[PDB]
């Protein structure tokens, strides 16, 4: 709707690059972790460009294009043993810029689109992230010549939070690991420019 108006020139997709699974950094869950504690959080796309999986081919189109619309899919894989137990919740907050420190509890996570991970069964969870932003496009990269009036590379936030603490048996493991994987289901890029390094 807004796509055709916001960009006079046509937008481009690179499915072969962007629509593949890419792992990001490992998450550690311990018995010390309490309910409502942030295990990890991601400002997207920023953190998938210039912190996590920086050498991924998914990031190649972001070098040249200045604008874009982005719909993502995030798979989470846990590996705790059968004598452990616990609950983790992953949720998404749309257009979170200067509103990360409010509506940021386990209760808010249960309200917003989310997935629930049991740490004993090792069930996989897939949360789908549409593009819900107050502008037509999100900016991909900051630059020295570009304005500082608009903060780029953030249309949403992902939170990984403890719902129920990890517990273990006598002489059992005091931690276990979760691995997130991401992919773009619909990444449309706009406004071609000279290639730059990401952040």
């Amino acid at each position: 709707g807004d796509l055709v108006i916001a960009s006079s020139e046509p937008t481009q997709q690179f499915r072969s690059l962007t629509n593949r699974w890419m792992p990001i950094n490992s998450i550690r869950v311990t018995v010390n972790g309490k309910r409502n504690d942030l295990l990890a959080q991601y400002y997207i796309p920023e953190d998938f460009l210039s912190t996590h999986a920086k050498c991924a081919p998914n990031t190649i189109p972001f070098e040249t294009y200045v604008y874009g619309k982005y719909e993502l899919e995030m798979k989470f894989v846990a590996n705790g043993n059968k004598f452990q137990c616990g609950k983790v919740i992953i949720s998404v907050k749309f257009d979170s810029y200067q509103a990360d420190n409010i509506n940021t509890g386990f209760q808010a996570a249960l309200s917003r689109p989310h997935i629930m991970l049991d740490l004993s069964t090792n069930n996989e969870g897939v949360l789908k992230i549409p593009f819900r932003y107050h502008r037509a496009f999100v900016r991909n990269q900051t630059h020295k010549t570009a304005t500082a009036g608009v903060r780029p590379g953030k249309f949403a936030s992902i939170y990984v939070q403890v719902l129920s603490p990890l517990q273990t048996g006598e002489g059992g493991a005091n931690d276990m690991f979760i691995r997130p994987f991401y992919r773009y289901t619909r990444a449309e890029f706009a406004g071609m420019s000279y290639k730059v390094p990401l952040t």
């Binding site: 420190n101 409010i102 808010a108 309200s111 917003r112 009036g149 903060r151």
Partner: protein
């Protein structure tokens, strides 16, 4: 166990569950605040009631009503960070005089102010009134009618207006700072006079981007007797 039968319609057909219906009934913003002709006018930032206008015991005294944050519709707007469409402002001038009081609409310019202000810090505005600059304006004539209801449009660049921030007084990227409003409504008198202001959602109005309930507190229990003395 049984799901039973709903009580909706039993007492009356006046259903009050619709979000839009709750947002369309008015909220007092300013209760008997002064208009002064030495200024450009009293600015009203075009945004719905929310946690942004909430009073906290100890902080600096503002012109705003203290119980805006505790209204139903403010509590609803704290759940939705996006809003699009028109708002309706009911303005009542405490007078019966024949002097015209002008209400001027300013579209989204990027600032966010409220109360009496001298635009560009001048000391004379009768020769250069904001209502006679070219912008859309409406007049109140208290002798005829001291009240008016004006509907302000969604004249902005953005798809949605941002309802609230985590910190309303934080100095961040200046263009993003102003995206919580869609413009201003400026009231200018002839002589010194008081006014009261209400706000509600228009017919053409939508909310989105559900955030869920925040962390809250209450002490209502303490200021009431129980049914057993």
């Amino acid at each position: 166990f049984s799901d039973g039968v709903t009580a909706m319609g039993f007492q009356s057909l006046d259903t009050q569950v619709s979000i839009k219906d709750i947002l369309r009934r008015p909220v007092l913003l300013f209760n008997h605040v002064e208009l002064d002709p030495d200024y450009t006018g009293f600015f009203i930032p075009i945004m719905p009631p929310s946690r942004m206008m909430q009073y906290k015991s100890g902080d600096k005294e503002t012109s705003f009503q203290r119980l805006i944050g505790r209204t139903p519709q403010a509590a609803i707007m704290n759940l939705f960070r996006f809003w699009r469409g028109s708002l309706r402002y009911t303005i009542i001038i405490h007078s019966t005089d024949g002097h015209p009081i002008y209400v001027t609409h300013v579209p989204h310019t990027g600032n966010r102010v409220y109360g009496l202000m001298k635009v560009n810090n001048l000391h004379e505005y009768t020769k250069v009134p904001i209502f006679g600059c070219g912008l859309t304006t409406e007049m109140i004539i208290p002798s005829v009618n001291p009240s008016i209801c004006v509907e302000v449009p969604f004249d902005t660049e953005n798809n949605w207006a941002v309802t609230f921030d985590e910190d309303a007084q934080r100095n961040y990227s200046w263009r993003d700072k102003g995206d919580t409003v869609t413009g201003h409504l400026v009231v200018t008198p002839v002589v010194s006079v008081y006014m009261s202001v209400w706000v509600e959602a228009g017919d053409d109005f939508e909310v989105s981007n559900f955030y869920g309930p925040p962390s809250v507190k209450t002490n209502d229990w303490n200021y009431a007797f129980s049914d057993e003395h």
